[PDB]
RNA sequence: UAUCUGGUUGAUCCUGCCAGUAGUCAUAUGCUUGUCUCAAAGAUUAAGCCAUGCAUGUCUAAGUAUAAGCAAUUUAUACAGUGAAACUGCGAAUGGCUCAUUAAAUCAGUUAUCGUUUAUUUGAUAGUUCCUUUACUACAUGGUAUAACUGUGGUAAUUCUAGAGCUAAUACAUGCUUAAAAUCUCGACCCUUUGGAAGAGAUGUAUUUAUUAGAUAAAAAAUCAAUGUCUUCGGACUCUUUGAUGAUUCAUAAUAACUUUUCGAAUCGCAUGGCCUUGUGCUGGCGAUGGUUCAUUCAAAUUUCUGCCCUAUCAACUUUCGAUGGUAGGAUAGUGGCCUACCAUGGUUUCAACGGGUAACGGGGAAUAAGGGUUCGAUUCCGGAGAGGGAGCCUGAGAAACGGCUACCA
RNA sequence: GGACUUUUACUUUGAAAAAAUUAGAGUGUUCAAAGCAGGCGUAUUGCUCGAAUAUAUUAGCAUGGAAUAAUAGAAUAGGACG
RNA sequence: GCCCGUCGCUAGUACCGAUUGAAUGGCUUAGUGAGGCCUCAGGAUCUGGGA
């Protein structure tokens, strides 16, 4: 979520080893280092566009993707920087042979790379253990945001 | 012992959870080094496989590298100036990573006029060729060179004292410098 | 809990050592060494329980206690000592050399082997890195490290070793239509070739094996084990050639032999 | 510690404990062979019974299934073995059919009479348990 | 009948916790420490002994103390030992200088000496030698395997360069 | 292996329950009891309490022998056989037992470590150790202080132990060493160039920090700052070197330094041989124990997905005193509200949160046979938990250990 | 190797997969419950077949299918291909 | 003929109920706080700043 001020905490915000010397005038102010997650996500250009520095995030810090890779569709965004997400599934009585409505909720980090609404379906990463209770990561939104554009004025 | 697990603590619905086994070693915490400054005293703590730590309490000297400078000499550690994580950590001059402390400046200024020929603030052949080789490239920096007139040079321990009873930094540079130095005035 | 298991519970005990239900209790534990548990033949069970020579456990100490067996070449005295898959056991006395390689059921079998292809083994590489000073290092299932190995040297390729001394004198890259053991799983065992792989990233990369009667089956990729070329192997194959017949085939093959 | 030493029963006995009609029956199945229980019937009945179970179980299986062939081909070659099934009826749509009496007449106490060598199902016992 | 302890001061009894190496208590098992009672190091008129240890001799002998002479039971047994029990300096040469303790069989008596430790001798100088050996030994070999790599590689690139020729 | 029968009425057909019937690796109890084989067995109630004995110790040619021990013989005047005691080493963290607690916990199947520790077994792995660097540092090998033992004692009493006198090391604590080469910084002198130099030091591995390399998505150019190799002196640079993964700041390497400086054999058993300038010179055989880092194996610790019995006469729950998340740190083997600061206001819930109950350890499984089901699993295997209850901790590779210690309660 | 891909349910075959138990093949423990043995000769100097197979579902993984049942798409064109 | 309730006897079960009734178990406020561990000191002694 972030957004504005980037250097807006008591410790100064930057990425591990990656020095930019100051003795050699250069256009650019900060360098930059990303990678792509692999899996065949695209690392999004908001990420190296950035300015953001979330250690959380999957293409800009120092986190690894592998485990499960998870979508479900979110509902809830009110956490800074991470989300929950709902994950729905059908589960088999045996007995009456028939299935019953469940769900989970996923609590995911998410990077300000990616600029998620609640009703998005989005794809998240397996993690290491990034909070208490986090243990994913978005890595892909899927969804747009669902016809809101088209909830316009009148003629 | 302090124990990290997360046994205890409710679970995100807030559930209270029942104790489940007494407290294992394996989980086990201890106590911080808050390791302070002046004259050498670090203590060995037997971690688990073999395996020593080391606790700083109480350190004077640390190894502090200027980066753009390309070295990393030795000094006195002044004191510590600036905490982003509490300030009973800089008015009780605690060392701990991200402390932002004070140094010495006359290791880095020994080296500096004997590999420039310059002298910061304000006859050799060999050297007069090394001297000349170097500059345009002995420029430093504003805000950097007028540290040193004041004697101390502004740091970040980069280490962990508590824990490999080094304390160590590099000289604070360009963004980063001119971040806490805005803080260190703007709460002066 | 506490500590390293030390015991064998007789029934948790592997399956394919063909170890008897009762006259006990334990099984032999094997110990740590070039061969994982769940998949060795620990010396007792090969020097007794398969060769016979031995009676007791106790008999199979003073047997080993006189190095007259020896692994791969060195002597080996450890009662339970993890011997597994391409090792070479050998007796002195009696001049019998050994190969340890897997039936069709999926079990050690007793197969002898020459005097001279005795002095060599096969080692899938499991894993090569780059070492401390610069040096690249090859490491193959049964723990074995070679350092300077051949760049075209990669991971999940097999590779002939010494014995002797401790250099690999070959390679073999995994290619579609190599000569392939399965070393695993319920066509463990078997012997056929390789059709083609399965990628699939972040993982279990599958491997589709065709022996030679025309069929086909699929392991995990960890589950092949490199042996040559089609026909040519680089070790003498048992009897059966790792084909596996149906239980009818396997029933009339052994009551078409009959008549006394 | 030790290995589980299996077992298993080998007789079952009547739902209805006084069928006036199963009790002649079986009486006279003993009086036959020389049995001493009404057990030694149910034993029987009870081999009898789930025989005709995996009989069954196999005949509901396509012609010509692997397993069905397989264990359906072994069924009948171990009945034959004991002379229960003959020789005709060899492809057990008559092990489905079969009765107890095809078993029972092939007990060595039945054998070691009705060859001679006893002349009485009783004898035959005496003579059998007395080595 | 419990001991005093160097330091405790105190005239009394008191309760305190034992470790390796230290009075009044033998570790039954490594890092074992037991509670036990101690008496203080201040004489009281509780004690039933006192020990105590002659500093200056007065003006008279006592009985069986100054007038009898106990012999120290066991002599110098590590080589420098001897050498400081004597003063040879690194060339007299123990092996004659060690000890000797007579004993009797009834009719044999015997001639029996310790067992001199780190004394220099031809063996040892065996193993110095050939440790010595093996590492450069070792350190040249493994630098041949080091050239005999750096070839395959060299004439591997010269592999890549008429291959990148023939096409 | 798809069956029913007795009981409501005067009789009738229903509904419906009660009774009969059969099995139970399902416990008891009663009567009766001859033969073979097989063999469960203080779970249930009281994870109640326990007299006594036993259940953990251990030595190879090869760490330590002046037993004032035995044996004597067979070469051993240092030692040498055998060997109590004791030191040192390893083990006692396995095993055995029990099912008290435990309901998203455990457990299962399935995952993760690019998130860590790992005695051991197995495979590799160490020429670098000193010093202002000709009158040198033990390396033909440096230091004591201790058991057993001897002797003097103390207490009713224990695997209590004190004062005195000895003596070992693979215990304790020290401390030397070795080829050539290249690269780096310094730079005494000389001379003006385009510039070059004798010789001085530094460079094992580990530790801590900062910096750099670790390419590759198809191809080319100009210019600034430094500055590499070859001159056919305007100039060119031509061959140009690259590991793995789905993915990394990976493996590995380079620079400046940091360290109460990790490791780099002061160890042991067998044989005794070459080799001349005849020094007991210089060499040298098989293999034990060790030793760092890496791997491997035995493991461990966390960890993804989904799955629990009854309960609403439990509807809201969670942040006192962390509840949900962010930043920094500290702590840990390491991730992580694990803990602490600061900041925010979040997390769960009728798809049943939270609470309660369980005469609840979970699985593999057991009993019942048309099928669908219903009931059960303390208990031979796997996992987990415990050792009267709680907490704490020493040792150690591994314990929050109980046939270990410390404390409180009983 | 680059550049991007509407989501699901169902079903198929398959991988990964402890043993003992269960079903079940082979074998005459004298029979049987069992057990995993045993069987052949030159029974004076060894020959030899075994120690199968099946079930293992819910979840996860892998693959074939495209019916049935959901979902998303282009209407203020902020459409689709170049 | 059947049949309803008060009333009366015997026995049994459960309910309500002064006793601000009793007992066991699990969590827990406040107060007091053993003990080991870490840490500031200390220095019986015993050597070369340390033990
Ligand atoms: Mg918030
Ligand atoms: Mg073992
Ligand atoms: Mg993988
Ligand atoms: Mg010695
Ligand atoms: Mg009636
Ligand atoms: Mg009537
Ligand atoms: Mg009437
Ligand atoms: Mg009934
Ligand atoms: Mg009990
Ligand atoms: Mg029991
Ligand atoms: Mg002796
Ligand atoms: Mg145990
Ligand atoms: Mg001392
Ligand atoms: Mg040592
Ligand atoms: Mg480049
Ligand atoms: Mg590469
Ligand atoms: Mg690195
Ligand atoms: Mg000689
Ligand atoms: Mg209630
Ligand atoms: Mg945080
Ligand atoms: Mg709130
Ligand atoms: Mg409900
Ligand atoms: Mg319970
Ligand atoms: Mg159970
Ligand atoms: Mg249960
Ligand atoms: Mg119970
Ligand atoms: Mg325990
Ligand atoms: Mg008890
Ligand atoms: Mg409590
Ligand atoms: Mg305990
Ligand atoms: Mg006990
Ligand atoms: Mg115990
Ligand atoms: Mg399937
Ligand atoms: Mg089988
Ligand atoms: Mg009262
Ligand atoms: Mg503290």
């Known amino acids: ?155 | 012992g302090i124990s990290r697990d997360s046994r205890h603590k409710r679970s995100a619905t807030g559930a209270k959870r029942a104790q489940f086994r007494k407290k294992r070693k394996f989980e086990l915490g201890r106590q911080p080094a808050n390791t302070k400054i002046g004259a050498k005293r670090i203590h060995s703590v037997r971690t688990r496989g073999g395996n020593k730590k080391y606790r700083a309490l109480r350190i004077e000297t640390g190894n502090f590298s200027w980066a753009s400078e390309g070295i990393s000499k030795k000094t006195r550690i002044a004191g510590v100036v600036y905490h982003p994580s509490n300030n009973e950590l800089v008015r009780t001059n605690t060392l701990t990573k991200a402390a932002i402390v004070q140094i010495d400046a006359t290791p880095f200024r020994q080296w500096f006029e004997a590999h420039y020929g310059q002298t910061l603030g304000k006859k050799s052949k060999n050297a007069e060729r090394k001297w000349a080789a170097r500059a345009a490239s002995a420029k430093i920096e504003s805000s950097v060179e007028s540290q040193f007139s004041a004697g101390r040079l502004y740091a970040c321990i980069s280490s962990r004292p508590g824990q490999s009873g080094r304390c160590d930094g590099y000289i604070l540079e360009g963004e980063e410098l001119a971040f806490y130095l805005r803080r260190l005035t703007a709460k002066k | 809990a506490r500590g390293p298991k030390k015991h064998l519970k007789r029934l948790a005990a592997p399956h394919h050592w063909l170890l008897d239900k009762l006259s006990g209790c334990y099984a032999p534990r094997p110990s740590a060494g070039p061969h994982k548990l769940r998949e060795s033949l620990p010396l007792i069970v090969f020097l007794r329980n398969r060769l016979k020579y031995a009676l007791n456990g106790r008999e199979v100490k003073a047997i080993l206690m006189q190095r007259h067996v020896k692994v791969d070449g060195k002597v080996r005295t450890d009662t339970t000592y993890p011997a597994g898959f391409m090792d070479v056991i050998t007796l002195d006395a009696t001049n019998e050399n050994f190969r340890l390689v897997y039936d069709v059921k999926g079990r050690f079998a007793v197969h002898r082997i020459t005097d001279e292809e005795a002095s060599y083994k096969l080692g899938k590489v499991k894993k090569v890195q780059l070492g401390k000073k610069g040096v690249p290092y090859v490491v193959t299932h049964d723990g074995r490290t070679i350092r300077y190995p051949d760049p075209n040297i990669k991971v999940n390729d097999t590779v002939k070793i010494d014995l002797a001394s401790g250099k690999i004198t070959d390679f073999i890259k995994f290619d579609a239509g190599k000569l392939v053991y399965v070393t695993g799983g319920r066509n463990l065992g078997r012997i056929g070739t390789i059709v083609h792989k399965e990628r699939h990233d972040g993982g279990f990369d599958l491997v589709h094996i065709k022996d030679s009667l025309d069929n086909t089956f699929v392991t995990r990729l960890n589950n092949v084990f490199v042996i040559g070329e089609q026909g040519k192997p680089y070790i003498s194959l048992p009897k059966g050639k790792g084909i596996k017949l149906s239980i009818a085939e396997e029933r009339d093959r052994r009551r078409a032999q009959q008549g006394l | 510690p030790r290995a589980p030493r299996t077992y298993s029963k080998t007789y079952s006995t009547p739902k209805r404990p006084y069928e006036s009609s199963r009790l002649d029956a079986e009486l006279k199945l003993a009086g036959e062979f020389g049995l001493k229980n009404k057990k030694e019937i149910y034993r029987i009945s009870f081999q009898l019974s789930k025989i005709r179970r995996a009989a069954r179980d196999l005949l509901t299986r396509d012609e010509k299934d692997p397993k069905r062939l397989f264990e359906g081909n072994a069924l009948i070659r171990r009945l034959v073995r004991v002379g229960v099934l003959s020789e005709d009826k060899k492809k057990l749509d008559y092990v489905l059919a079969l009765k107890v009496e095809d078993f029972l007449e092939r007990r060595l106490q039945t054998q070691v009479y009705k060859l001679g060598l006893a002349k009485s199902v009783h004898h035959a016992r005496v003579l059998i348990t007395q080595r | 009948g419990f001991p005093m302890k160097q330091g405790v001061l105190l005239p009394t009894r008191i309760k305190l916790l034992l470790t390796k190496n230290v009075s009044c208590y033998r570790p039954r098992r490594d890092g074992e420490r037991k509670r036990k009672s101690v008496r203080g190091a201040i004489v009281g008129p509780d004690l039933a002994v006192l020990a105590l240890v002659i500093v200056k001799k007065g003006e008279q002998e006592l009985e069986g103390l100054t007038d009898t002479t106990v012999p120290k039971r066991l002599g110098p047994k590590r080589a420098n030992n001897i050498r400081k029990f004597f003063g040879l300096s690194k060339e007299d040469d123990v092996r004659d200088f060690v000890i000797r303790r007579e004993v009797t069989k009834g009719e044999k008596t015997y001639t029996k000496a310790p067992k001199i430790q780190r004394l220099v001798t031809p063996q040892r100088l065996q193993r110095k030698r050939h440790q010595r050996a093996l590492k450069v030994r070792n350190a040249q070999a493994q630098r041949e395997a080091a050239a005999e790599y750096a070839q395959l590689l060299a004439k591997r690139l010269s592999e890549r360069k008429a291959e990148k020729a023939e096409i």
């Open chain 1, 1 to 155: 979520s972030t957004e504005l001020t980037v250097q807006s905490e008591r410790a100064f915000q930057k990425q591990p080893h990656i020095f930019n010397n100051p003795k050699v005038k250069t256009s650019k102010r900060t360098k930059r280092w990303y990678k792509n997650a692999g899996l065949g996500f695209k690392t999004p250009k908001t990420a190296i566009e950035g300015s953001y520095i979330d250690k959380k995030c999957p293409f800009t810090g120092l986190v690894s993707i592998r485990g499960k890779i998870l979508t479900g569709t979110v509902v809830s965004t009110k956490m800074h920087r991470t989300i929950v997400i709902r994950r729905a599934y059908l589960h088999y009585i045996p007995k009456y042979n028939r299935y019953e409505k469940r769900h989970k909720n996923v609590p995911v980090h998410v990077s300000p790379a990616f600029r998620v609404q609640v009703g998005d379906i989005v794809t998240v990463g397996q993690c290491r253990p990034i909070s208490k209770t986090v243990r994913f990561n978005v890595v892909k939104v899927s969804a747009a945001a669902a016809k809101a554009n088209k909830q316009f004025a009148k003629f």
